[PDB]
Enzyme design. Structure first.
Site, PDB file in Angstrom:
ATOM      1  N   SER A  13       0.810  -1.221   0.000  1.00 22.00           N
ATOM      2  CA  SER A  13       0.000   0.000   0.000  1.00 22.00           C
ATOM      3  C   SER A  13       0.841   1.267   0.000  1.00 22.00           C
ATOM      4  O   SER A  13       1.925   1.302   0.579  1.00 22.00           O
ATOM      5  CB  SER A  13      -0.894   0.056   1.240  1.00 22.00           C
ATOM      6  OG  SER A  13      -2.192  -0.450   0.988  1.00 22.00           O
ATOM      7  N   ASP A 121       7.481  12.900   3.636  1.00 25.63           N
ATOM      8  CA  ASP A 121       7.368  11.548   4.177  1.00 25.63           C
ATOM      9  C   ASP A 121       8.593  10.620   3.984  1.00 25.63           C
ATOM     10  O   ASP A 121       8.467   9.502   3.472  1.00 25.63           O
ATOM     11  CB  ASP A 121       6.102  10.859   3.646  1.00 25.63           C
ATOM     12  CG  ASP A 121       5.592   9.789   4.594  1.00 25.63           C
ATOM     13  OD1 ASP A 121       6.007   9.803   5.783  1.00 25.63           O
ATOM     14  OD2 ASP A 121       4.759   8.967   4.152  1.00 25.63           O
TER      15      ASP A 121
HETATM   16  N1  LIG Z   1       7.734  -3.436  -5.530  1.00 24.45           N
HETATM   17  C1  LIG Z   1       7.320  -2.196  -5.901  1.00 24.45           C
HETATM   18  N2  LIG Z   1       7.776  -1.665  -7.110  1.00 24.45           N
HETATM   19  C2  LIG Z   1       7.367  -0.392  -7.494  1.00 24.45           C
HETATM   20  C3  LIG Z   1       6.491   0.359  -6.660  1.00 24.45           C
HETATM   21  C4  LIG Z   1       6.015  -0.199  -5.398  1.00 24.45           C
HETATM   22  C5  LIG Z   1       5.090   0.580  -4.448  1.00 24.45           C
HETATM   23  C6  LIG Z   1       4.079   1.670  -4.758  1.00 24.45           C
HETATM   24  C7  LIG Z   1       3.598   2.199  -6.097  1.00 24.45           C
HETATM   25  C8  LIG Z   1       3.466   3.634  -6.377  1.00 24.45           C
HETATM   26  C9  LIG Z   1       2.974   4.076  -7.691  1.00 24.45           C
HETATM   27  C10 LIG Z   1       2.624   3.076  -8.710  1.00 24.45           C
HETATM   28  F1  LIG Z   1       2.193   3.480  -9.947  1.00 24.45           F
HETATM   29  C11 LIG Z   1       2.740   1.645  -8.463  1.00 24.45           C
HETATM   30  C12 LIG Z   1       3.229   1.228  -7.150  1.00 24.45           C
HETATM   31  N3  LIG Z   1       3.540   2.119  -3.575  1.00 24.45           N
HETATM   32  C13 LIG Z   1       4.151   1.356  -2.634  1.00 24.45           C
HETATM   33  N4  LIG Z   1       5.065   0.426  -3.063  1.00 24.45           N
HETATM   34  C14 LIG Z   1       5.713  -0.535  -2.174  1.00 24.45           C
HETATM   35  C15 LIG Z   1       6.205  -0.076  -0.802  1.00 24.45           C
HETATM   36  C16 LIG Z   1       7.079  -1.097  -0.089  1.00 24.45           C
HETATM   37  C17 LIG Z   1       6.373  -2.447   0.046  1.00 24.45           C
HETATM   38  C18 LIG Z   1       5.850  -2.954  -1.317  1.00 24.45           C
HETATM   39  C19 LIG Z   1       5.029  -1.899  -2.065  1.00 24.45           C
HETATM   40  N5  LIG Z   1       6.469  -1.516  -5.053  1.00 24.45           N
END
Ligand SMILES: Nc1nccc(-c2c(-c3ccc(F)cc3)ncn2C2CCCCC2)n1
Length: 287
Positions: A13, A121
């Site tokens: 998330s 953040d």
């Molecule tokens: N593995 C991975 N690769 C790219 C992005 C993200 C992602 C996004 C995110 C933001 C914008 C978007 F278009 C798509 C994903 N928001 C949170 N996370 C992570 C936080 C750490 C824990 C795992 C999820 N995660």
């Protein structure tokens, strides 16, 4: 979604929206997808990523649209966050690994500010290591709590304003942010400084405080931050870490932080120890 994306299983998330591990069926590559129910922030946040596109350690937005009852945003797949790697190493990083990370993080923060926005953040969770070849690279994410600190054209800083509420994580938040002052560049850096000492120690000394209200725990954290002198927080470690935090706390509201000076601080300690920048982090030597 998008006629070329296979939605996948949730992997996490963001500040708003949920994240899935999808696949760009057409290019044969894994991706991460953020969804938002139609009915608003995604479209606004996507415009901020678009303004960030290109920088080192800034994920790439592959698509943005609407599919049924969801507005969709798609990005390239990244590896573990720093919080996750830290945990995988018994929450213990060698001096060599902390110094390797500090260098890159000061850099991502500098980039965002360069784009008229302040992150607001900074935490280990918003920093992800790349995968494969990109495994020596630290990435930064999430612009949901971002705000423009200056006019794109005038660079006219926003009015100093008070009685603003905390938008971020208390543990890494700046003292001024606690005092309710409008957030600016200095606050993103002070946050990093705490993150680095967290890596050296395992935790921070104002971690694990408790209150009935989310609002009252934020103030207890404030009280403890303000009560812990930097020479104590950093005792038993190279003096460089104390020097870094003292620098951040002296910055003025609309001041532009000296990013380079900070990085140089850690680089010198690095050499006296005889370390080399080979990106062999503690996690790489695991068997
Ligand atoms: N593995 C991975 N690769 C790219 C992005 C993200 C992602 C996004 C995110 C933001 C914008 C978007 F278009 C798509 C994903 N928001 C949170 N996370 C992570 C936080 C750490 C824990 C795992 C999820 N995660």
């Amino acid at each position: 979604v998008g006629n070329r994306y296979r939605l996948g299983r949730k992997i996490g998330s963001g500040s708003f929206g949920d994240i899935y591990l999808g696949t760009d069926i057409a290019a044969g590559e894994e991706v991460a997808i953020k969804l938002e129910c139609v009915k608003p922030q995604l479209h606004i946040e996507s415009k901020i990523y678009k303004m960030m596109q290109g920088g080192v350690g800034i994920p790439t937005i592959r698509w943005c649209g609407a599919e049924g009852d969801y507005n969709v945003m798609v990005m390239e797949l990244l590896g573990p966050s720093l919080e996750d790697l830290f945990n995988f190493c018994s929450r213990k990083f060698s001096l060599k690994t902390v110094l390797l990370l500090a260098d890159q993080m000061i850099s991502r923060i500098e980039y965002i500010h360069s784009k008229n926005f302040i992150h607001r953040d900074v935490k280990p969770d918003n920093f992800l290591m790349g995968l494969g070849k990109k495994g020596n690279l630290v990435y930064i994410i999430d612009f949901g709590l971002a705000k423009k600190y200056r006019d794109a054209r005038t660079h006219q800083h926003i009015p100093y304003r008070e009685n603003k509420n905390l938008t971020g994580t208390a543990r890494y938040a700046s003292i001024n942010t606690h005092l309710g002052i409008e957030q600016s560049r200095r606050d993103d850096l002070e946050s990093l400084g705490y993150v680095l000492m967290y890596f050296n120690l395992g935790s921070l000394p104002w971690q694990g405080l408790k209150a009935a209200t989310k609002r009252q725990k934020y103030e207890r954290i404030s009280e403890k931050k303000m009560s812990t002198p930097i020479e104590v927080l950093c005792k038993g470690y190279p003096s460089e870490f104390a020097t870094y935090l003292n620098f951040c706390r002296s910055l003025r509201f609309d001041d532009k932080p000296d990013y380079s000076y900070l990085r140089q601080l850690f680089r010198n300690l690095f050499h006296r120890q005889g370390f080399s920048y080979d990106y062999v982090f503690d996690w790489n030597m695991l068997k």
